[PDB]
Structures are given as C-alpha cells and as structure tokens.
Design a protein around this ligand. Structure first.
Ligand SMILES: *[C@@H]1O[C@H](CO[C@@H]2O[C@@H](C)[C@@H](O)[C@@H](O)[C@@H]2O)[C@@H](O[C@@H]2O[C@H](CO)[C@@H](O[C@@H]3O[C@H](CO[C@H]4O[C@H](CO)[C@@H](O)[C@H](O)[C@@H]4O[C@@H]4O[C@H](CO)[C@@H](O)[C@H](O)[C@H]4NC(C)=O)[C@@H](O)[C@H](O[C@H]4O[C@H](CO)[C@@H](O)[C@H](O)[C@@H]4O[C@@H]4O[C@H](CO)[C@@H](O)[C@H](O)[C@H]4NC(C)=O)[C@@H]3O)[C@H](O)[C@H]2NC(C)=O)[C@H](O)[C@H]1NC(C)=O
Ligand SMILES: *[C@@H]1O[C@H](CO[C@@H]2O[C@@H](C)[C@@H](O)[C@@H](O)[C@@H]2O)[C@@H](O[C@@H]2O[C@H](CO)[C@@H](O[C@@H]3O[C@H](CO[C@H]4O[C@H](CO)[C@@H](O)[C@H](O)[C@@H]4O[C@@H]4O[C@H](CO)[C@@H](O)[C@H](O)[C@H]4NC(C)=O)[C@@H](O)[C@H](O[C@H]4O[C@H](CO)[C@@H](O)[C@H](O)[C@@H]4O[C@@H]4O[C@H](CO)[C@@H](O)[C@H](O)[C@H]4NC(C)=O)[C@@H]3O)[C@H](O)[C@H]2NC(C)=O)[C@H](O)[C@H]1NC(C)=O
Ligand SMILES: [Ca+2]
Ligand SMILES: [Ca+2]
Ligand SMILES: [Cl-]
Ligand SMILES: [Cl-]
Ligand SMILES: [Cl-]
Ligand SMILES: [Cl-]
Ligand SMILES: [Cl-]
Lengths: 64, 209, 208, 65
C-alpha cells in the first residue's frame, strides 16, 4: 500500500545490528517515529532522513 | 469474582514500525459493590507506569468491564520481553497476575505459495484464490490480499496449524467473481512475519496457462 | 470441586455405519480423598445402563480424571436426541448435570476441490497437495487422504473457519515426496459430512 | 476397506421420509447386527445391502400418502 518502505527497512536493519546495546537500539528506532529523524521537521520521515539515520546506526555499530 | 484476560498485540503491529503494538489487560465480572480496580504492569519484572486505564464500562448483564492498555516497543516484544498484568480488587482473595510474551524458539522463515482456483471451481460464479503460508515459527503472522495496490477484503484466513516439523502453516482464501479472475487481474498475497526480510513479502497470483 | 465436560461423538463415527459413535463424560479435579464418581446417563430423558467407566487416572497436577463412555446410535444423534450426564461425588454439594445434542441449523453441502502444488514449490524435496472444503454447515466434518486405497500419513487439516455467508471452510494439506507427485500417482481427498450423499465424497488429485 | 453399499443403504434408509423412526431404526440395526447377513457369512454383501435397501424402500413407497 502506501507503506514507507525506507522507514520500515531502516527499522528492520537497526533491529538486527548485532553490536548495538539496548539503549542505542532504542534511541535509533525511536527517532524513526517521534520526529527526531525528521530533520526538516515537515511531519514525514523522508527517504533522505531514513537513509541518514540508518547510516548513523551502522556507523555506531561498526565502531563497536 | 472478577476474571482477568491478557491479550497480546496484533502481529502486524509489532512488525511494522508505523503501527503501535499494545498489550491489553481486561477485567470482567466487576461488581457494582466493589468496582475499584488497581492495575500494576511489569516488563521483565520491572514495574512500568505508562499504561492507560479506560473508564469502566457497564455491560448488559450489570457487570463492569475495566480495560488497561500498555503500549509496547516493537523491539521489546520481538526480543521476547515478558509483560505481566496484576489486578487487585476487594472481591478477589488475592490479586490476579497474568503474563504473556512472544513464543520462544528459533524463528523460521515462512514459505509463501499462491494457488489458482481448482478447475472444477471454474464452473462456479465465484472462485477461490488460495495463499499457502508454510514453515514459519513463531505462529505470530499476518496475511492480507491486494490487487492493484489496494486491499482485497473478501478473504478469510485460517488459524495457524502446527505442522509435523514443529513449524506452522495456514491458508488464506480470497473469494472473487469469476469474471475478475478471467480478465487477467493480478492479485497479491501479502505476508508479515519476523523471520522475513523487512518483516514482509508478497506473492502474485493471476490467470496463467 | 470436580468439573464436568460432556463431549459429542467424532463426526466420522456418527456418519459411517461401520463405526461406533460415543458420547464422553469427563470428570476432572477429582480429589484423592473422595475419588469415587457415580455416573447417570440419560438418552432423551430415560436412564440407560450401557455406559462404561474407565479407570481413574491421576494427572500431572495431582488430581484424578474419570471418564464415562456411552455408545450412541448413529440415527439418534443425527436426529437431535439429548444425552445427559449426571456426575455425583461427595466433594460436590449436589450432582452436576451436562446435556449435549447435535448442532442445529440448516445443513449445507460442502464443496470439495483439490489443488496441485504451486509450481514454485517443485524445487523442494517435498510438495504440498491441498484440499479445499467450503460452504458446509454444521462445522462438524472429517477429512482424510488416500492413495491407491491406502491412508496417507503426512497430512494436516485446519479447523473449520466461519466464512462470510455463515458457512464454514477449511483446508487439508498433504505432504508427499516430490518424486511421488511427478510420477503421476493419484491421490484422493476424502470428506465426510452429514449434508453429503452417503455422508462422504472423494475427489482425485494427480499431475495429468 | 469401506463397505460402500452398506454405507449407502444406511444413508438412503436414514432419509426415507415416510418411515416412522421405529421402522428406520430397525432397518439400520439390521445392517450391523447380523439380521441383514442372510447367508451367515459375517459380512454384509452387496446383494444383502441392495435387497435390504430395496425392501426398506418398498415400505416407504407403500406408506406414501
Ligand atoms: C457479563 O457479560 C460480559 C459481557 O458479555 C459478552 O460480551 C458481550 C459484548 C456480548 O457479546 C455477550 O454475548 C457476551 O456474553 C461477560 O464477559 C465475558 O466473559 C467471558 C468469561 O466468561 C470472557 O471470555 C474470554 O474471552 C477471551 C477472548 O476474548 C476476545 O473474545 C471475544 C471475541 O470472541 C471478545 O468479545 C473479547 O472482547 C476479546 O476481544 C479480544 O479483545 C482484545 C482487547 O481489545 C483485542 O485486542 C483482541 O483483538 C480481541 N480478539 C478478538 C478475537 O476479538 C478468551 O480468550 C477466554 O478464553 C480463554 O481462557 C479460558 C480460561 O478462562 C479458556 O478456557 C479458553 O480455552 C481460552 O483459553 C485461553 O485461550 C487462548 C487461546 O486459546 C490462549 O491464548 C490463552 O493462553 C488461554 N488462557 C488460559 C487457558 O488460561 C474467555 O473465553 C469474555 O471475553 C467476556 N467478554 C467481554 C466483552 O469482555 C461476562 O462473562 C458476563 N458475566 C456474567 C453473565 O456473569
Ligand atoms: C489438571 O489437569 C487436567 C487435564 O490434564 C491435562 O493434564 C494437564 C496436567 C495438562 O497437561 C493439560 O495440558 C492436559 O490437557 C485438567 O482438565 C482440563 O481442564 C480444562 C478446564 O479446566 C478442560 O478444558 C475444557 O476443554 C474442552 C476441550 O477438551 C478437549 O480438548 C482439549 C484440548 O483443548 C483436550 O485436552 C481434551 O482432552 C478434550 O479432548 C477431546 O476429548 C474428547 C473426549 O475424550 C474427544 O472425544 C475429542 O475428540 C477430543 N478432542 C480433541 C481436539 O482433543 C473445551 O471445549 C472446554 O471449553 C469450554 O469451557 C471453558 C471453561 O473451562 C470455557 O472457557 C470455553 O470458552 C468453553 O466454553 C464452553 O464453551 C462452549 C462454547 O460453545 C459452550 O458451548 C459451553 O457451554 C461452555 N461450557 C462451560 C463454560 O462450562 C474447556 O476448555 C480440559 O478439557 C481438561 N483436560 C482433560 C484432558 O480433561 C484440569 O483442569 C487440571 N486441574 C487443575 C489445573 O487444577
Ligand atoms: Ca521530513
Ligand atoms: Ca453376507
Ligand atoms: Cl462443571
Ligand atoms: Cl433426570
Ligand atoms: Cl497422564
Ligand atoms: Cl473414507
Ligand atoms: Cl460432491
């Protein structure tokens, strides 16, 4: 349907990042649905914003 | 005396991030004499305080129904955290405690197959489009039908059935007018399960040789 | 205190004349101090004495389970006669009475269709043969699989599911080795239901 | 192995509209208690099923209003 695929995929990938602890996984997932990831504050999580939040989670995962 | 029933979130709500999963604690047979109900929620043994209690609801049989709803985090449920509801009421000798969680065990990826109508069903005015979903664990799963990007809502889905190998299977039956099937319209079985990539996949079904 | 559950006969037993349908009265939570249970059976209000009490069985929760089995006539159950089980036990202030009968409602004939395996499943070592049974009422039904007159031993059947029109449907999934399906072996879905002629039908399923 | 004729005789007799319950009850019992086993071989042969059904159908037609 009108599913936000990039948001759903970022959620799934973040959910399975093995090196993140609980609080980090909790904070990244929460940013997908509470505005934190909505960098332009337009009320919708755009593909740019999903990709950028995912890249940040992968980067912290690789650094650990 | 009061009875308590604890209900899990909908499988689709825990798997799709755009949705809100909830565990629901329902207290039934609450009397008019002792209608006060206290709820204590616990997530993995730690008490939480973000639950919302709905106003008591009188039923046709002159008993109250009290509901408390606790929002849960998608990852907490999918990772197997335990949710405990504790209900206190003067009509009970002691508080009642109910616990639920996602089923334990190694998750297994569903196999999704679409089956066209039986040749003998092609003589009926309505035909059955079938979706076989097999080999998945846990039984938490959601199955829907679509056509041209919009949902088809004249379908029924069986409950999960335990298979020989310990996994689960089910069937979803979509009923459509024969004319729609004969015109080459494409139908889609949509499946949502934790063991699928992105928690969802789809299989198409249309008139083939 | 003890609790009582009265169960009807198995659908196959009431529909096939060569089988013996039974109503089963189960008494659970029977105490160790008062394990004696007395059964009184009634068929259409008259007491009968052909019931058999199975030896009590202690359960994992440290309570006894006592079962009484009463043979019934096929036509009596199908015509809606009421079977009453009355259970007496010194732990009960008064006997417990449970009554059951055949489900009421206009019978509706099941439609039985066989579906071959999805072509996409033909890459697996085992394939799924499907039997669609729809449009029947009541939900009491039995489904079996056969091949060359012999029973198949790897099939699972869903519970009856309420459809939009008030009738029921279900699926039966028969798992066979892919080699068996590709070799043209003929399989048969057997369905037993009161609204069917002879109370049973069979539908074949083969490659070509 | 299923006795199709016996099963069919049971079904047909079960639905004969003009028989009273006692008659239909007696015919069905004869399918499984020897009464219908006219050649005492212990098994209800196709001949006996058809003949018992034909005999049961005969009473049903004779009772038609
Ligand atoms: C006074 O009247 C009230 C109100 O009347 C009733 O409702 C109104 C609206 C009318 O329709 C009336 O006809 C009707 O009488 C009576 O209240 C009822 O009380 C009974 C208890 O006697 C409760 O029974 C339980 O029901 C649950 C299932 O509940 C869903 O059930 C209904 C749909 O079928 C629905 O009405 C409910 O609201 C509930 O809805 C779910 O709700 C959540 C919350 O929003 C939602 O998220 C879900 O999506 C939704 N689901 C659906 C499908 O709609 C049932 O689970 C209970 O049985 C389990 O427990 C038994 C042990 O107590 C056991 O024997 C059973 O086998 C079963 O086993 C449990 O089984 C499950 C699955 O098999 C398993 O997961 C559990 O682990 C297992 N637990 C065990 C074994 O411990 C039970 O049947 C009614 O829900 C309740 N009605 C309402 C609306 O609250 C009241 O009884 C009357 N009192 C009098 C006359 O004195
Ligand atoms: C101590 O243990 C015993 C049994 O040990 C068993 O041992 C323990 C240790 C565990 O290992 C268990 O897993 C194991 O089962 C306990 O006794 C159990 O007690 C519960 C209730 O407390 C009974 O529940 C009832 O179950 C019936 C269905 O029963 C069949 O299906 C069961 C599977 O769920 C199966 O286990 C049973 O053996 C039985 O199996 C059938 O058996 C018959 C006869 O042999 C056979 O012909 C069938 O072919 C066979 N079928 C299958 C599929 O196996 C269920 O129908 C009951 O539901 C009604 O009542 C509920 C109230 O408890 C209510 O919540 C429901 O909503 C439902 O409502 C009734 O609702 C209908 C709806 O239309 C309505 O018409 C009725 O009027 C209404 N009646 C009411 C409300 O009274 C019920 O859930 C178990 O059967 C029983 N198990 C056995 C083996 O006897 C005992 O409780 C334990 N003691 C403790 C813990 O203190
Ligand atoms: Ca934005
Ligand atoms: Ca003979
Ligand atoms: Cl009881
Ligand atoms: Cl009486
Ligand atoms: Cl046991
Ligand atoms: Cl059969
Ligand atoms: Cl048919």
């Amino acid at each position: 349907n009108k599913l936000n695929k990039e948001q759903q995929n970022a959620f799934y990938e973040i959910l399975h990042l093995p090196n993140l602890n609980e609080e980090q996984r909790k904070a990244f997932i929460q940013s997908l649905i509470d505005g934190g990831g909505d960098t332009n504050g337009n009320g919708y999580l755009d593909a740019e914003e999903s990709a950028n939040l995912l890249a940040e989670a992968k980067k912290l995962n690789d650094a650990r | 005396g009061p009875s308590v029933f604890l209900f899990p979130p909908k499988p689709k709500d825990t798997l799709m991030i755009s949705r809100t999963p909830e565990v629901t604690c329902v207290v039934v047979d609450v009397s008019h004499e002792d209608p006060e109900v206290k709820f204590n929620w616990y997530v993995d043994g730690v008490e939480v305080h973000n639950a919302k209690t709905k106003p008591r609801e009188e039923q046709y049989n002159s008993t109250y129904r009290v509901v408390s709803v606790l929002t849960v985090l998608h990852q907490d449920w999918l990772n197997g955290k335990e949710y405990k509801c504790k209900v206190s009421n003067k009509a009970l000798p002691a508080p009642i405690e109910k616990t639920i969680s996602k089923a334990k065990g190694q998750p297994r990826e569903p196999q999704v197959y679409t089956l066209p109508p039986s040749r003998e069903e092609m003589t009926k005015n309505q035909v059955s489009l079938t979706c076989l979903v097999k080999g998945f664990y846990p039984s938490d799963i959601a199955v829907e039908w679509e056509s041209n990007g919009q949902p088809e809502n004249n379908y029924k889905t069986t409950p999960p059935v335990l298979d020989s190998d310990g996994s689960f299977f089910l069937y979803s039956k979509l009923t459509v007018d024969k004319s729609r099937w004969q015109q080459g319209n494409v139908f889609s079985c949509s499946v949502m399960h934790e063991a699928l990539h992105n928690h969802y996949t789809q299989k198409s079904l249309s008139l083939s040789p």
